Write a protein that binds this ligand. Structure first.
Ligand SMILES: Cc1cccc(Cc2n[nH]c3cc(O)c(C(=O)N(C)Cc4ccc(Cl)cc4)cc23)c1
Length: 207
């Protein structure tokens, strides 16, 4: 069964702003997603000190960037802590509201969309390049879930597909005019410019 949820008003507004605003510096979405992967990897590295059994679902702590020109998708995979069904919906809850509002006000005060991550809502920058985002996640304490949204004020959640052990996979179904983010040289340049100091291996898969 598929569950359909409405985004909180501020999020639906933020997502419309991101989609409708003229903003050429779209490449910032990647830094935001990598930064989110990095935080999940730190959380699993930290929980594994006190409880080593939390790494039974996978020892390797890494980020994989997977472009697929046939499906027109860019996949960002990590082996971080992952998210429970509760983490999924709770992170699309009241926490994001304060950040969204502060970001919304900053933009009116002259800040630009590249500052989105400082407000903890960097994920939504994925809608600068993606017409639809699918998020597959697996936490040690729960089952595998698939979150999906093409914006429009709603998102869906369902029990997920091939098992992934532990972590989060972000599948960006790119807009027709955003296929440059499938090119090896373009992804390399962006990772080098914005994510050069990430404390985890970043493997750019080739096709
Ligand atoms: C649909 C959806 C729902 C909730 C949050 C997101 C943001 C997101 N983008 N890329 C990610 C990669 C990840 O490994 C995680 C992850 O599993 N974490 C434990 C770290 C984490 C949690 C909350 C936030 Cl706000 C940021 C990082 C999340 C994200 C997207």
């Amino acid at each position: 069964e598929v569950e359909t949820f409405a985004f909180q008003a501020e999020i639906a507004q933020l997502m419309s702003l991101i989609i409708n605003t003229f903003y050429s510096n779209k490449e910032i979405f990647l830094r935001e997603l990598i930064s989110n992967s990095s935080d999940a990897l730190d959380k699993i590295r930290y929980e594994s000190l006190t409880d080593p059994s939390k790494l039974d679902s996978g020892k390797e702590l890494h980020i994989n960037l997977i472009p697929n020109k046939q499906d027109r998708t860019l996949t960002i995979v990590d082996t971080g802590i992952g998210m429970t069904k509760a983490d999924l919906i709770n992170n699309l809850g009241t926490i994001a509201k304060s950040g969204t509002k502060a970001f919304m006000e900053a933009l009116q005060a002259g800040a630009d969309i590249s500052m989105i991550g400082q407000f903890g809502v960097g994920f939504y920058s994925a809608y600068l390049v993606a017409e639809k985002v699918t998020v597959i996640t697996k936490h040690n304490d729960d089952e595998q879930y698939a979150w999906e949204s093409s914006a429009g004020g709603s998102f869906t959640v369902r029990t997920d597909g091939e098992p992934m052990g532990r972590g989060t996979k972000v599948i960006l179904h790119l807009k027709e005019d955003q296929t440059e983010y499938l090119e090896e040289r373009r992804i390399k340049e962006i990772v080098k410019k914005h994510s050069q100091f990430i404390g985890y291996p970043i493997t750019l898969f080739v096709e």
